[PDB]
Amino acid sequence: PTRLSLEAMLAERAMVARQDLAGLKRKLAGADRVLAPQSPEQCGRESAQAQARSVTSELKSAVKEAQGLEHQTLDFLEQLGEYPVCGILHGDHPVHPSGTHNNNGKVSVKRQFAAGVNTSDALTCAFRFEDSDLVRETALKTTYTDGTWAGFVQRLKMQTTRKCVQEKVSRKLLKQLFPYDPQKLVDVSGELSELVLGIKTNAIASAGPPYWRTKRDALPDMLDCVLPLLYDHIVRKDLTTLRNKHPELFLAECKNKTDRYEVESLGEKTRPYFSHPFHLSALVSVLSQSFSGALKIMTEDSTSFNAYGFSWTNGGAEDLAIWARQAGEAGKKPPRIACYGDDTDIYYRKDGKLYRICPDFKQMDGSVDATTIEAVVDYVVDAHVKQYPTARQFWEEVGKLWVEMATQSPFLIDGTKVYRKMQKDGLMTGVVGTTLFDTVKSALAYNDWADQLMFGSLNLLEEKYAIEFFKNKHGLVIKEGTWKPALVNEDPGFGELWTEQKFLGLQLKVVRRENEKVYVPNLPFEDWLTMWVTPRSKYRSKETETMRERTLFDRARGLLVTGAVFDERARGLMGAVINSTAPEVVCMRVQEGGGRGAPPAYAFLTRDGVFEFPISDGYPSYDWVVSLYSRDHPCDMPRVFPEAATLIASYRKQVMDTRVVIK
Amino acid sequence: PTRLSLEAMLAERAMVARQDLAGLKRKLAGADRVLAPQSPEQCGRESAQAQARSVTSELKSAVKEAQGLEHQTLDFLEQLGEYPVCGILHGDHPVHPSGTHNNNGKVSVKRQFAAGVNTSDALTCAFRFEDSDLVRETALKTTYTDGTWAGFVQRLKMQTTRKCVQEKVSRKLLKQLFPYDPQKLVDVSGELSELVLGIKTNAIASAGPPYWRTKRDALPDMLDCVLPLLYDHIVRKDLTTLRNKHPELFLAECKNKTDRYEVESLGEKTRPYFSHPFHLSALVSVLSQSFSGALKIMTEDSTSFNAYGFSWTNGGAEDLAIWARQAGEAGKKPPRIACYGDDTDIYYRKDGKLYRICPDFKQMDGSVDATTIEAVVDYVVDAHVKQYPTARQFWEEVGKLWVEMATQSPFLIDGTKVYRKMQKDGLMTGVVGTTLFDTVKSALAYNDWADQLMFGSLNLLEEKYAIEFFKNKHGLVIKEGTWKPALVNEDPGFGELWTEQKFLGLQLKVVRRENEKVYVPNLPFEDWLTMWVTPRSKYRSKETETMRERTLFDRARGLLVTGAVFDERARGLMGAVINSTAPEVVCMRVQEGGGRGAPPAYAFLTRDGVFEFPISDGYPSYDWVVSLYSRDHPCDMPRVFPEAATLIASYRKQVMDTRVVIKEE
Ligand SMILES: Nc1ccn([C@@H]2O[C@H](COP(=O)(O)OP(=O)(O)O)[C@@H](O)[C@H]2O)c(=O)n1
Ligand SMILES: [Mg+2]
């Protein structure tokens, strides 16, 4: 009665069974389970939940108090009046949706500073399986929050009013500092629709004005309607008329960044960023994503100061060490300098011994000068038009929009008043290319620093003079106490640190794989703990209990992979979270990671940023994680339930031989 | 902000959009629509539904009257007492689920003779777009129904108690009449699990006793638990113990077939068929489906009597005519005879003129003798063991089970009494291999018929003598009036028939593509209309209006492809239905046909039975359908809404050139 094969029927059956949680629960009941090493229970279920709730309650009160503080005026910004709501229609609807972001015909926004913090689930697990005092102390220092009005304005003022230093910079110099492979550059002489369709972005991010919807929601309006209109005014050299008639098409929104913040500085520090119109960001992203994909990193070309694109897995961690060891004596041979946005790793030798410095810039975007920004854009544009000269003029026009977006877009903050940064200097954080602008500004300053070493100014190795130098000569503010050269353990033993310092937020450690040294990332337990108990997620009451339980599992898998497996205490905690995850939650069909489970939040595991788990019901063993970082002696990801496939299929193959003798 | 490309974002958006009927309806609002040829509306919505309800009401009352008829006794069967409910456990549960098919510990069933018929939607369309009197009369003749107790027992008695003639048949004769390709036989000397996982069946069919669930539900119980138990007793030559301990494992169920039945004979005719245990049918299916996949058909080998596997598309229809024309003068050269189950196409020449016969066998399964059945099994088993001798003993044992299933399975009918056919003769309809057993029995009889022509008995060309011959010499009953030779139009012009007769339920017709003849299937309007107004589905209250409207759309496509597009009137009716289908229903994401829309009901378009529409939102135009039947590659299926995709995506590409000179230097 041919309709489908039994093989196919069995598969269909199994795919449907992973969606029946009641059935999974039954079928996995006595299943053999592989248990992670885990910390012992420290208190009972109710106590863990009460301790977490007490902490959350205190943080909520701290946020509410800080949110109640008056903020300073916005008088440090230029004020431009009000913008009319865009009236452009795309078929049956306006591109600016009716009855939203509209105050009597004028574009409007409202800043959200909510009282709610992150959820208690992760913190409950922490109290359940770790030291009460340490958990409590750790959890009280940081919280995931909207921040505050006062802190928002304070930080906005700092990065829009700082006195900058114009860099001395040319194509020739940027070529030396940021070599790239021209063959990897996108053919921007291709047709524009196709180029823009190739850029990647966050589907649920704001599309900005005039759309006031997510990017995936606003994507047809942008592509089908606004983009060709923008294109027509570009090529007719008539952007002025478009700007004047439809100012919302060039308007940005200045927003408070919801983030992990130190509780004690909530009233002084909330980070601003800018959200630009989708058509502008997507157009410019054609150049910016093409360039970043073509950039060499330091470990590939030792003349390069670029670490933007560096990642830890597949030898990456060890690549850093090998590259760094080539650092020479200060004043004689080149140091090793790695820039990624506002993060830097500096190596030099004094009397033969390797030293490492990992300084912080204070609010770096405030120090990014207009000359650097224009030179970066010129560098990126010229790289493409050198390789693809027939599209030179179009992309040079795009370059001008890019500079504008990075330095001078008008923006809303709260209500209808439109603002503009008083000076071209200062980078408008969140503009496309933010990372590259930061990276370049950092490298230019540090390249000059290295030049001064060779000039014989060795006192620039010392915090006092280094800080003065970066301030007076580059307008950069290095945080006092963060210029602290440390002796490098150049060939660490098993379990030993490279140094105690962080780069890209992680320490470098050596661990054992058989008799091989494997270089891996690492953190102190307290830092894993802070991340764990402050998930970047607000309390969603639409979230089922199953979803919450599955989130804990995925986040634990994520932290382990990021290197929490290499700290006993974090390993034991993530292990307890995983072991306490129900069989049906482990094995259910999940949506994130394309059915493979939510990828780790940490962004620099792989260069393309996309880490994917092999299976949604695997757990990160030490052996498996180690193999992710080695250049390789790989292995599969171990399943939590080795027999899950057949318990779920209700079928275990028995060999039945048709060739038997019966007689 | 890297997460996914705008291109992938677009695509994801558009897959979402096709599931949002409100949005599809709005976006397709004033879209350009390509219309199929249609018959014009003949009455309003309300008028159509009213007349449809009128007919439906009359059918239900006719069905209820026929179902109230007392049925004759089942004394004609052997009675075997009652069977104990199977207690075999598969892990955490019994393979025979608790509280089902269990009367005080004995296996039980209840026959369903429900009063409801098919739904009225399609009939409403018929009334909306066609002649009132003709639609009413057509729709009253036939109804989709469970049948009756009275008709069911009457047809069961006929099928189980007929005097059969034992065929004279050897492997040599079957090799002649049923050649096959030995290299196309599955390697049955491979591991059994893999063999069984390769057979194909209907996921929602009953798995039979002891499962009492659908085959997809019962599948792990069958595969993981019962099958190896069966295997083990087979190889230990110990089936007797298994049978005696667990008799539900060999029990069948005798069922009434829900089908299209003639109203006036409802009380005398309801087809029985048998539902065997899943482990049994699956095991035997390894041989049976391997063999049917290896068989040659008539048009591949002119010695072959076999049409089992013939299909109409891709030149099939013309292959039949090409094969048929080779028929020679009766008594001097061989006829052309094609058998498919109980369906037969016969050609011979008389004074050089080609003639065609298309007779009907009455209740053929009652005439299939045990000798024929054992010869077919032996033939199929031998075919495999000659090619794969290392598994000879296992499969000969399966062959014994197969014969038992085909002739002697004990079975339930209604309640707990277990029955069995008294004589071995008579085929238990629905057993795996039913079609082949039927095909071989018929072929053996027509082969003998042909020889008698060659021996000089030319009076066997006439119904009176033919009917007598098939009765007396083969135990087969040819329906009076259906043996009527017809002059074949050997090379029909455009729009002309081959003859008016049917084979596999369809006529053969020639139509024009450009200026070439293409051979196609065809029916008169009335036969299409009968099929249209009697869908093979019950009234389910679970079904939404969207689902019902879509079904109409899909069934109209199905009939067009089957050949209704080649009859102007039926074409017009299907087109009217298709054109009156709402844009959102036409364009929505559909689950059937793997997303391309429910395939046609008709089972012999392709040899594998599977036909797949290219797209779910296209319609079957004359040009597209005619290309399915010619050997030329099928042209595109035309979209109902050529701009649906760009309209749904809300995006139409514009070329924007990056190489423009913006400023003269
Ligand atoms: N009705 C439900 C309930 C839970 N879930 C699962 O809940 C999980 C969400 O938790 P997660 O750890 O992966 O990620 P986030 O919720 O932290 O973003 C997904 O894997 C979903 O498959 C679901 O998909 N549908
Ligand atoms: Mg366009």
Author numbering:
A (entry chain A): 10 to 672
B (entry chain B): 10 to 674
Q: What text comes from the article?
A:
In this report, we describe the structural and functional characterization of the RdRP domain of the permutotetravirus Thosea asigna virus (TaV), an insect virus which infects larvae of Setothosea asigna (Lepidoptera), the major defoliating pest of oil and coconut palms in Southeast Asia. The RdRP core adopts the classical closed “right-hand” architecture consisting of fingers (helices α3-α13 and α15-α16; amino acids 41–303 and 375–443), palm (α14, β6-β8; 304–374 and α17-α18, β9-β10; 444–519), and thumb (α19-α24; 520–649) sub-domains, encircling the seven conserved motifs (A to G) that are required for substrate recognition and catalysis. The C-A-B permutation of the TaVpol palm, with the GDD motif (residues 350–352), located at the β6-β7 hairpin, and motif A residues D369 and D374, lying at the end of strand β8, is spatially compatible with a canonical organization of the active site. Additionally, in vitro polymerization assays show that the TaV enzyme is active in a primer-independent reaction, thus confirming the existence of a functional relationship with flaviviral RdRPs.
TaVpol-GTP and TaVpol-CTP co-crystals were also obtained in presence of MgCl2 and the corresponding structures solved to 2.3 Å and 2.25 Å resolution, respectively. In both cases, clear electron densities were observed for the triphosphate moieties interacting with electropositive residues at the rNTP tunnel. However, the corresponding nucleoside parts were disordered. In addition, these structures revealed a second nucleotide binding site in a totally unexpected region, a cavity inside the thumb subdomain, at about 30 Å from the active site. In this position, the nucleoside moieties of the bound NTPs contact residues M556, T560 and D563 from the α19 helix and to E601 from the λ6 N-terminus, whereas the triphosphate moieties remain partially exposed to the solvent, appearing mostly disordered. It should be noted that the nucleotides are bound next to a strong electropositive region, residues R564, R545 and R269, also containing an extra density peak, interpreted as a sulfate molecule derived from the crystallization solution.
